[PDB]
Amino acid sequence: MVRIIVKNVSKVFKKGKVVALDNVNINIENGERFGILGPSGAGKTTFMRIIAGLDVPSTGELYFDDRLVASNGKLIVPPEDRKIGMVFQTWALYPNLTAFENIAFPLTNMKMSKEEIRKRVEEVAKILDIHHVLNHFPRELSGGQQQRVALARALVKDPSLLLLDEPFSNLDARMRDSARALVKEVQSRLGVTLLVVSHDPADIFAIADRVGVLVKGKLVQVGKPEDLYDNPVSIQVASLIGEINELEGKVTNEGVVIGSLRFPVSVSSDRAIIGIRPEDVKLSKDVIKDDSWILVGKGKVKVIGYQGGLFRITITPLDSEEEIFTYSDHPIHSGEEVLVYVRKDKIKVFEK
Template identity: 30%
Template structure:
């Protein structure tokens, strides 16, 4: 295998602050490299440098793409093709070239020839035309790369088949579930016939079953197309399953490279588990939910029963988990709890002090009396982009405190959200764009905590966290509960987190709560349903294992049966 990319002594800084330090890395033709590292380690910066379509900080060193290129049509192939006839059929012979992304200007043709064949999937961002159908999204992608074949529609259909999305061709993109969106993103990227796929946390916020489906289609594409891939994931299992070689990035430096098993072991060596004791007893009920139902009317799906007749109590100081596959009704439930989505029927009462507040009655004198003591971290959180971090944690959320007190509280809240004291102090004056995705997510968590809520609802709080950061946050949540007596409702796909942090959990399926109890038992129940339908991918041969594995199309039909698509445009009834 020839070296395709060689990164030599690459360093990147922003105004003198180093974020990548002396990186050396080789990616061979068809090789899959997994990058592990804590939040803020520099994974995304490295991916963007390799993508080569934007200037990222101030870079020194070399990022060499060894390629074979046709002088006539500018087609680029792996270096091993040098001396062979051009693959586009133009008749010219491919010649060896090396392009250095550090030296070469952003708009230089030689760089653009290479970046045309580099694809990226970015964490938490579904780069799709939301109002267009899935098919139109792929046709647009073909137009964008200048595809002029007479078989454009067939080509688009083939790509959708490759990512197992043939059954969703005419669906509107924004109405797809997260896992489906990610598969369409992949199809759009495959249009470029990439030599390398840069996958930055492609499945961070998906439930285990959808994450498996996405990994499977990514891996199948990598095998059948003989692409190289660099994948970052905070789930060590993903690296174990997909990568030939792993790299451990820490604080901008590569501290180890080698066999994925060995590197994952090193990454996890400081993971000590959680030693905060959970209490056996809680206070009186603080939330009472009875026969709660929410129906939406959707243009293409008619009436969707997002939540159907659920009842549960949450006790003061309890950490209560809501788990279930994508589309089960968890987010809708949490939005009804905080009062942003009105229920179709049923009741939600929240106790503030000695008084019960009916959350179904709007107005400051009704549900408003409770909502000011409740905080929610949305899955699709956002920060104020034109304010720095300390402003985001104070003025922007109308917290009127003397500056020094604001800073003190902000540092406390950032520590609960998993930042060390030194890092918390260091980021206060930074703009949100200067933080990594995981760091921004944890600032949003701190923003919720700044308002001293009695009840905290967190929707997918660990989606962007590596296991070590997650352990720090688990610790802090348990400590916060012990010291401050807060009550938490945690909606999560992260089964380890649910088991570690929650006192009790409810399993939601098709809008209903099917069981409530000890988090370990509830997680086991969800996972047993997942494994019944799981098909594994082997990184070495791409075969789909498991005679009992069910077909992807079967799974999709199940998704459809449970209404596994979101419709922002749907209205409430």
């Protein structure tokens, strides 16, 4: 419901020694679900605090629709006037206010009567299915209920923009899919612009339609999540959007050579970095009968792990310490020699 224009936004700390954001430019469309991923929780948080109005750009400008909200060290439109709801891992529920009180809090100075506040709080709580625990303090709420109360608090003033900073990080891993689905439902229902920052790509895949990746304060790539996943600009971006094996080898006429492995790709440099995601690797003891996989050579099993009911099999090529891991239903025991197949079209290569 609001367009956000981020224009040459930079932010420094420590009198300039730390550059948290460096000339960031993004135009977020009204109702878009946009995500940010990157190695720096602090920098992503810096970006979110600037959008919220809790901080300002050192240089550059920020617009909500055609409205200049911050510019060159100045806060022009404060948080309370920006039509934003915040769900931030760092903004907890107030422990000694009930759920009702926590959700009513933002309405305190909105010129509403007691009945108007009650009606609005009850309406939102009904929609989020926490109307029956309004009298509980936060400690007496389940995790899911706490999540819902925090979202209700963010939605009580009918915002145009919902800002989420590590919003599911307090939940047990098993409850996060449900929380991601709730946010999806709320966004669809309200049509709000939504910005989400997270270290976890599952959050971005579940919620965002376009994502930017921040590295050293710079937006290095922006696109649909699946596009970053398959066509990352660098191995660093490749790894931020999902698991990937990173290998280094020599460029030859026959491919990139890494011990007993040879990948049928090339770059102009003497050496190359190969990226191959675990789902794009398959192991066998003899040749398989499947033209959708290509042989890249022999390897030896180094170690096995067990996660998610699957075996995580790590191999190395012969005559190399480089590792490749993949997941499988059955193990191949340590020390075994195996053939290594990959999906040809999924090999990522970069100049070293």
